[PDB]
C-alpha cells in the first residue's frame, strides 16, 4: 500500500508545517 | 388430464392436516395451481396460488398467515398444509390448473375435490340473480356486475366464466368474457362492458344445467359470487 | 413514370427481441400480426410476442441446424426446417401440456430452405433437390412433387389466393407452379447469379425474386416479361430477404451488407437505409396488416422497425 | 498530530502562568508590563536588564532547546521594546528549531510536491481515458460479454480510485493552505467545519484502493478459469466475482474505521502512528498481489507451452509475442518489486524516497494502460468503430 | 404492349395507398411499440 | 401497469432461465465438423468414435462434451449451406493415403489427390473458415504403406523426385497438403495417421482441441 503511506507521510508532515507555522503566527504578533 | 387429491377426515376446530394434491397427465411443473375452495352451500372462494417454478407466491387475505403451502416438483403435488384449523373452513377443496401467455386459457382443467369436515382494498364483484328456472329451448341469457371496470388498457377484459355441472368439478366455458374455450360447443357468446358483463347460453341442451359461476382476474384476490344457479 | 416520389422512409428500432444464444436464420410473421417465431441455430427455436418482447414458448428441437420456419394461418402450428430434411411440424395449441411435434415429414435428399404453409392442412416445402413438394400433413407423405429446375430451389413464396407460387432456384431463374394440377405455367429469367428469396405482389400479378449480385426484379404472371430491374453501383452484397408492404408500393430488401434498403415499386429509388445490425440479416417480415416489419440478423438478437 | 497535541498543551501552558498572576506582589521597584505575550511570561523584576527566563516547555522540540533564556529588554522608563508595526519584540531566534531542520523540510516539500503532481497529471491523464474507454464498453453493447463485462467493472474500479485520491488531494488544500491569523478560527478548525469530509474521504479513499487491488484479484482468478488451470470448480460465475471484488474491502475498511474512530479521531484520519491499527488496511493489499503472483507465475508457464507450433511463424517473435503479452498482461502484475520485504515498518532513508515513487508511478498510470490495452489495442472494438466510423459516413 | 402490366401495376399501389402502415407515417397512438 | 400479464413475464423469465441454462452448457461442448471427399475414410473414424441429410455423433472423452456433426452427403453444393457452420470449434478434413493410385470414377481424368487438393483449397480459403483450425487425419495408413512398395507414384505428382519411402513420401505429402493455408498464422493444421489399426486416435483429438480453445482464448484476451 503506498497512498496509505504516502497520504499519511504528506499528513505526518503537513502537520507539522502548520505546527511550525503556529509558533510563526505567536512570534510576530 | 388428470388431478388427485386426498387428506380428508374429521378434526376438531384447532387440528391441522397436510393437504396434497398430486399431478399427472401433464408437464406439471410449467402450470400455475389454484386452491380455489367452495363453501358446503355457499360460493367459491379463492385460497392460494403458487406460479409456474415456485415463483410469485400469493394467499388470500382471509388466510394470510395461517396455511402453508408448497409443491414439491419430483413428486408433482402441492402441499397445502393447514395449521390452526377454523370451524368456518368446511370446504370441498379444489385443485385448479391455471396457464398464462398470450392467447391462453388459466383455469381450464380443475380438481376432483375432496372434501374436509370440521367440527364446532378488496375488488369485490356481484351476481346478477341466484337462481333462473329456465324450460331447455329457450336460448336463456344471463349477466354479471362488478365494482371495477375491468377493461384495462391493454385491450382485453379479464373475466372467466364457468359452469359447475352439479357434483362434479367447475367447468370452464368462455376464457376473457369474448373466447369460446377448448371443450365447449360453438352456440355461447360473452360480452360486457367495463363492469357489466353477460353470457348468452343459446339452445339449452341436457346437462348443462348446472350452477354458473364468475372470476375476476384483474388484481389477486379473486371472487366468484353466490352463483347464479339454474332451474328447470 | 409520372407517379410522384414518397420521399425518406426512416424507421426505428422500436424493439429489442434478445434472448437468442446463435444465429437466427427465419422470422416468420403470425397469422394475426402479433407473434413471430425465430428460428435458432443453438438448440431452441422460440415464438415470441412482439408488442410486450415475451416468450410464450420455447421449443427444444432436434434438428439442431434450423434453415427456415413457419407459422400457420390457424395460428397453432410451427413447421421449423432444418437440412437434415425432417420438417418437423409442431404443435402449439395442446391439450394439457406444453409443447409437441406432430409428424416429422421425412422424404427429402436436399436441405430444407423455406417451407410455407398453404393452408393448416398442406405445407408446401422447397428444399435443395430441385424438388418444392406439397405435402399432407397426417399423413406423413408427399402428395405431389414439383420438378422443372436444373440447380436447387432456396426458397418460396405463396400467392395470396392459394393457387400458385413461384421457385426460389439457384439457376437464375425464377419458376410458377400450380396447387391443383402440378404443372409448369411459366418460367422466368434474368437473372445471373443464384437467387435468395422472393416475396410476392400483394394483388398476385408479380414477385420480387432477390438475387446474389444486388438486383431485385420485378417479374410478371400474365404477361411473360420482367417489369422493373434494381440496381446501385455503390452496393455489391448478395441479397438475403425480399418483402413487399402491404400494399406493394413499398419494398422492404434485406441484404449481406449488415442492413435493410427499401427500394420503390417503380422508382426504384434507395430510399430507406434500416440499418443497426453487427452480422448480416437473415430474414424479415411484413405483417398482414403492415403495422411492423422485423428483420433476423446473425447477431442473435430482432428489431421491429416502426 | 502534534499541533493539536500543542494546541491544547498551549492551553494548559496558558493558564498555567496566569494562574501565575494570581501569586505576583506589586512592584517594589521600577514595574514593566508584567503580562504574557502569547509565548513568554516573566515575574517582571528587572534592574534595567533584560529577562532571564526559560524559553517554554510547550514546544514540540521543547527538551532539544531547553537549557536556554528567551530575552526581552525592559526599558528604564518601565517599558519593553516594540517593532516597526508596533507589535512585542523578544528574542526568539535562539530558541528557534535549528535550521538543518528546516532545510531538511524544505527539500523534502519540494519531493511532496513532486510526487504529488506526478500522480496527479496521471490519474487526470488515465481518467479522461478511462471514461472514453469505459463509453464503449456500454455505447456498442458487448456489455455482457463476461470478459468486458468484468473489464467494464475494472474500468469503474480505477475511477473510484482515481477520483478518490484527487479528492483527499484538494481535501488536504482546504484543510492545509488557510492563514491562521485569527486565534479564535484555529480554535474551532481543530474539530469543526468542512472536516467531516475529510474523514468521509479519508475512507472513500482508503476504499478506493482495497476495491482496487482485490479486483485485480478478481481479474486473476478470471484469467485463472478461462485458461482452465488446477482446481477448476464449477458455477464459479461473477456474481460470485461482484462479492469477493467490491464487497471484500467492505469486510476490510469499516473494521479499520471502527477501530480508528474509537481511538483516534486525529486531524483527517490519515496519519498512522500504531501500523498495528493500520496493519487491517494493509493485510489483503499484501495479499491480493501474493495471490495474483501466483496466477501470474502459473500463466507464464502456459505461453512458454506454446513454444512449439510457431515454427512456420518467424523465429524472432517467440521474444517477441513471449513479451508482447508480459506488458500486455500486467493490469496485476506491476506491484511487488519493492514494497514485498519493506512493507513500511522500516523502509526510512532515500529507501522511502524510492519505494513511494515507483508504485506511485505505475498505479497513476495502469489506469491509462489498461483503458487503452484491453479496450482500444484489441481488434475487436476498432473494428466496431470502423464500421461505426463508416455508418457516420452518410449522416 | 409494354403498358399492359404496367396499367395494373400503378392501378393497385395507389388504391391501396392510403391504408399503408409504411408509406404515410402512422401516429404515436396506432404505433402500438 | 402490468394488470395480469404479471404472471407472463414471470414465465417469459422462467424460460429466459433456461435458455442461458442450456447456452451455457451447449457452449462448453466442442462441436466440430468433419468433412470428407467421396470414400476418403470418413466411416472409420465415426466407428473409431463412441456414439435423410446430416448426422451426429454425441460422443465425449475424459471429461468433456463432444458434438460431431458429419457432412454426410449433401446433393446440393457446399455454396449454399455452408453459412451454417461458422463458430464451429476445429473442422476435420480426411483423406485416405491409398487414394491416389485410382482415378475418380466422374471423368477419370483429375486424380483423387488432385481432385481432394481441389476440395481442400475450397474450404480453408473461403469466407466463412478464416480461423477455424483444421485438422486433417491422413487415412489408410497400412493399406498405403504395401501400396507404396509396388508404385513409383509418379501418376500422382510428377514434380516430386525423391525415394518410395512410407517415411519419406507420406511425409512429403503431409508438407503437400497443409502448405494450401495462405493464413499460416491463424489456422494450426494438425495432421495425423490412422487406419483400420492405430487405435485410440482420438486422444490426439482430445489434445488437439484442448489445444485450440486456449489459442481461441488467448487469441481474444488479446494476448495469443
Known amino acids: 500500500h503506498s497512498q496509505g503511506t504516502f497520504t499519511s507521510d504528506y499528513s505526518k508532515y503537513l502537520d507539522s508545517r502548520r505546527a511550525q507555522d503556529f509558533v510563526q503566527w505567536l512570534m510576530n504578533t | 388430464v388428470q388431478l388427485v387429491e386426498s387428506g380428508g377426515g374429521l378434526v376438531q376446530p384447532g387440528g391441522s392436516r397436510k393437504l396434497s394434491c398430486s399431478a399427472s397427465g401433464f408437464a406439471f411443473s410449467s402450470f400455475g395451481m389454484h386452491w380455489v375452495r367452495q363453501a358446503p352451500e355457499k360460493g367459491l372462494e379463492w385460497v392460494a396460488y403458487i406460479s409456474s417454478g415456485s415463483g410469485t407466491i400469493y394467499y388470500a387475505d382471509t388466510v394470510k398467515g395461517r396455511f402453508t403451502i408448497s409443491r414439491d416438483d419430483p413428486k408433482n403435488t402441492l402441499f397445502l398444509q393447514m395449521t390452526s384449523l377454523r370451524s368456518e373452513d368446511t370446504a370441498m377443496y379444489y385443485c385448479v390448473r391455471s396457464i398464462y401467455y398470450y392467447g391462453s386459457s388459466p383455469f381450464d382443467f380443475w380438481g376432483q375435490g375432496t372434501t374436509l369436515t370440521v367440527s364446532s382494498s378488496d375488488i369485490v364483484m356481484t351476481q346478477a340473480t341466484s337462481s333462473v328456472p329456465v324450460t331447455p329451448g329457450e336460448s336463456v341469457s344471463i349477466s354479471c356486475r362488478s365494482s371495477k371496470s375491468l377493461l384495462h388498457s391493454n385491450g382485453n377484459t379479464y373475466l372467466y366464466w364457468f359452469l359447475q355441472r352439479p357434483g362434479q368439478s367447475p367447468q370452464l366455458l368462455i376464457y376473457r368474457m369474448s373466447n369460446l374455450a377448448s371443450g365447449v360447443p360453438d352456440r355461447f357468446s360473452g360480452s360486457g362492458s367495463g363492469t357489466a358483463f353477460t353470457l348468452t347460453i343459446s339452445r339449452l341442451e341436457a346437462e348443462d344445467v348446472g350452477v354458473y359461476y364468475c372470476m375476476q382476474h384483474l388484481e389477486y384476490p379473486l371472487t366468484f359470487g353466490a352463483g347464479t344457479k339454474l332451474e328447470l | 413514370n409520372n407517379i410522384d416520389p414518397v420521399g425518406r422512409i426512416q424507421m426505428r428500432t422500436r424493439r429489442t427481441l434478445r434472448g437468442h444464444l446463435a444465429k437466427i436464420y427465419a422470422m416468420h410473421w403470425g397469422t394475426d400480426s402479433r407473434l413471430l417465431v425465430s428460428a435458432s441455430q443453438d438448440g431452441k427455436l422460440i415464438i415470441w410476442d412482439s408488442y410486450t418482447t415475451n416468450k410464450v414458448h420455447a421449443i427444444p428441437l432436434r434438428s439442431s441446424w434450423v434453415m427456415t420456419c413457419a407459422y400457420a394461418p390457424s395460428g397453432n402450428y410451427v413447421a421449423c426446417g432444418g437440412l437434415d430434411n425432417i420438417c418437423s411440424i409442431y404443435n402449439l395449441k395442446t391439450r394439457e401440456g406444453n409443447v409437441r411435434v406432430s409428424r416429422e415429414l421425412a422424404g427429402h435428399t436436399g436441405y430444407l430452405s423455406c417451407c410455407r404453409f398453404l393452408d393448416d392442412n398442406q405445407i408446401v416445402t422447397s428444399s435443395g433437390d430441385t424438388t418444392c413438394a406439397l405435402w399432407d400433413i397426417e399423413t406423413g407423405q408427399q402428395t405431389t412433387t414439383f420438378t422443372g429446375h436444373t440447380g436447387d430451389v432456396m426458397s418460396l413464396s405463396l400467392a395470396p389466393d392459394t393457387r400458385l407460387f413461384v421457385s426460389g432456384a439457384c439457376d437464375a431463374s425464377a419458376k410458377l407452379w400450380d396447387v391443383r394440377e402440378g404443372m409448369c405455367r411459366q418460367t422466368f429469367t434474368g437473372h445471373e447469379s443464384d437467387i435468395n428469396a422472393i416475396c410476392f405482389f400483394p394483388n398476385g400479378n408479380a414477385f420480387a425474386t432477390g438475387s446474389d449480385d444486388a438486383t431485385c426484379r420485378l417479374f410478371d404472371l400474365r404477361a411473360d416479361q420482367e417489369l422493373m430491374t434494381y440496381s446501385h453501383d455503390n452496393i455489391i452484397c448478395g441479397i438475403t430477404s425480399v418483402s413487399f408492404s402491404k400494399s406493394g408500393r413499398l419494398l422492404l430488401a434485406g441484404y449481406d451488407d449488415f442492413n435493410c434498403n427499401v427500394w420503390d415499386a417503380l422508382k426504384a429509388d434507395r430510399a430507406g437505409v434500416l440499418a443497426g445490425h453487427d452480422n448480416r440479416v437473415s430474414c424479415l417480415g411484413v405483417t398482414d396488416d403492415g403495422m411492423a416489419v422485423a428483420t433476423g440478423s446473425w447477431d442473435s438478437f430482432l428489431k421491429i422497425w416502426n | ?395 | 404492349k409494354v403498358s399492359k402490366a404496367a396499367a395494373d401495376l400503378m392501378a393497385y399501389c395507389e388504391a391501396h395507398a392510403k391504408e399503408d402502415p409504411l408509406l404515410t407515417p402512422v401516429p404515436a397512438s396506432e404505433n402500438p411499440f | 401497469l402490468s394488470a395480469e400479464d404479471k404472471a407472463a413475464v414471470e414465465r417469459s423469465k422462467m424460460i429466459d432461465r433456461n435458455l442461458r441454462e442450456d447456452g451455457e452448457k451447449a457452449a462448453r461442448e466442442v462441436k466440430l465438423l468433419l468433412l470428407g471427399a467421396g470414400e476418403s475414410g470418413k466411416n472409420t473414424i465415426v466407428k473409431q468414435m463412441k456414439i435423410t441429410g446430416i448426422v451426429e455423433t454425441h460422443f465425449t472423452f475424459k471429461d468433456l462434451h463432444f458434438k460431431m456433426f458429419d457432412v454426410g452427403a449433401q446433393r446440393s453444393e457446399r455454396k449454399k449451406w455452408i453459412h451454417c457452420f461458422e463458430g464451429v470449434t476445429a473442422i476435420i478434413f480426411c483423406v485416405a493415403l491409398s487414394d491416389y493410385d485410382l482415378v475418380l470414377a466422374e471423368d477419370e481424368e483429375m486424380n483423387r489427390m488432385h481432385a481432394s487438393m481441389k476440395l481442400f483449397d475450397s474450404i480453408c480459403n473461403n469466407k466463412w473458415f478464416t480461423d477455424t483450425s483444421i485438422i486433417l487425419f491422413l487415412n489408410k495408413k497400412d493399406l498405403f504403406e504395401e501400396k507404396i512398395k509396388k508404385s513409383p507414384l509418379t501418376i500422382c505428382y510428377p514434380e516430386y523426385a525423391g525415394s518410395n519411402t512410407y517415411e519419406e513420401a507420406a511425409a512429403y505429402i503431409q508438407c503437400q497438403f497443409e502448405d494450401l493455408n495462405k493464413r499460416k498464422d491463424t489456422k494450426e493444421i494438425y495432421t495425423h495417421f490412422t487406419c483400420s489399426t492405430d487405435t485410440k486416435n482420438v486422444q490426439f483429438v482430445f489434445d488437439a482441441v484442448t489445444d485450440v480453445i486456449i489459442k481461441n482464448n488467448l487469441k481474444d484476451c488479446g494476448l495469443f
Request: charged content about 15%.
Open chain 4, 1 to 395: 498530530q502534534v499541533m493539536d497535541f500543542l494546541f491544547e498543551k498551549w492551553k494548559l501552558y496558558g493558564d498555567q502562568c496566569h494562574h501565575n498572576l494570581s501569586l505576583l506582589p506589586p512592584p517594589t521597584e521600577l514595574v514593566c508590563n508584567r503580562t504574557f505575550d502569547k509565548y513568554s511570561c516573566w515575574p517582571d523584576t528587572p534592574a534595567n536588564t533584560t529577562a532571564n527566563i526559560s524559553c517554554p516547555w510547550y514546544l514540540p522540540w521543547h527538551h532539544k532547546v531547553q537549557h536556554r533564556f528567551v530575552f526581552k529588554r525592559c526599558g528604564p522608563d518601565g517599558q519593553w521594546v516594540r517593532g516597526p508595526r508596533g507589535q512585542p519584540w523578544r528574542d526568539a531566534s535562539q530558541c528557534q528549531m535549528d535550521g538543518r531542520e528546516i532545510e531538511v523540510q524544505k527539500e523534502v516539500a519540494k519531493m511532496y510536491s513532486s510526487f504529488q503532481v506526478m500522480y496527479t497529471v496521471g490519474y487526470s491523464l488515465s481518467l479522461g481515458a478511462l471514461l472514453l474507454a469505459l463509453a464503449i464498453l456500454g455505447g456498442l453493447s458487448k456489455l455482457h460479454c463476461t470478459r468486458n463485462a468484468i473489464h467494464a467493472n475494472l474500468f469503474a474500479s480505477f475511477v473510484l480510485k482515481a477520483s478518490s485520491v484527487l479528492v483527499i488531494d484538494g481535501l488536504l488544500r482546504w484543510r492545509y493552505s488557510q492563514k491562521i491569523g485569527d486565534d479564535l478560527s484555529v480554535s474551532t478548525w481543530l474539530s469543526d467545519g468542512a472536516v467531516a469530509g475529510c474523514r468521509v474521504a479519508a475512507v472513500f479513499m482508503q476504499y478506493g484502493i482495497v476495491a482496487n487491488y482485490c479486483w485485480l484479484l478478481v481479474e486473476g482468478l478470471y484469467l485463472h478459469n478461462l485458461l482452465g488451470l488446477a482446481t477448476l470448480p464449477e458455477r464459479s460465475f461473477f456474481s460470485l466475482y461482484l462479492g469477493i471484488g467490491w464487497g471484500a474491502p467492505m469486510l476490510f475498511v469499516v473494521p479499520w474505521a471502527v477501530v480508528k474512530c474509537l481511538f483516534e479521531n486525529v486531524q483527517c484520519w490519515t496519519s498512522n502512528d500504531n501500523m498495528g491499527f493500520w496493519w487491517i488496511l494493509r493485510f489483503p493489499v499484501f495479499l491480493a498481489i501474493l495471490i495474483n503472483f501466483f496466477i501470474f507465475v502459473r500463466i507464464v508457464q502456459l505461453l512458454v507451452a506454446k513454444l512449439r507450433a510457431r515454427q512456420m511463424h518467424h523465429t524472432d517473435y517467440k521474444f517477441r509475442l513471449a513479451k508482447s503479452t508480459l506488458t500486455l498482461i500486467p493490469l496485476l502484475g506491476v506491484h511487488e518489486v519493492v514494497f514485498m520485504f519493506v512493507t513500511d515498518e522500516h523502509a526510512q532513508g532515500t529507501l522511502r524516497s524510492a519505494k513511494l515513487f515507483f508504485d506511485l508511478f505505475l498505479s497513476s498510470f495502469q489506469g491509462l494502460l489498461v483503458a487503452v490495452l484491453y479496450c482500444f489495442l484489441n481488434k475487436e472494438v476498432q473494428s466496431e468503430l470502423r464500421r461505426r466510423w463508416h455508418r457516420w459516413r452518410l449522416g
